[PDB]
């Protein structure tokens, strides 16, 4: 349950990998 | 009230400051 922690929507974990390893 | 959306995604994006270094290797933002 990490997606809800960031935002209720419009937020994916796949976004962190874009700039960091 | 100032109109500006802020969330974890915004915090997550802000990572480009420390991330996206790739050292001296330059590549399209992707």
Curated annotation (Swiss-Prot), chain B:
Q: Which domain of life is it from?
A: Eukaryota
Official protein name in the record: Insulin B chain
Organism, per UniProt?
A: Bos taurus
What would be the name of the gene that encodes this protein? INS
Residues included from the entire protein: 25 to 54 of 105
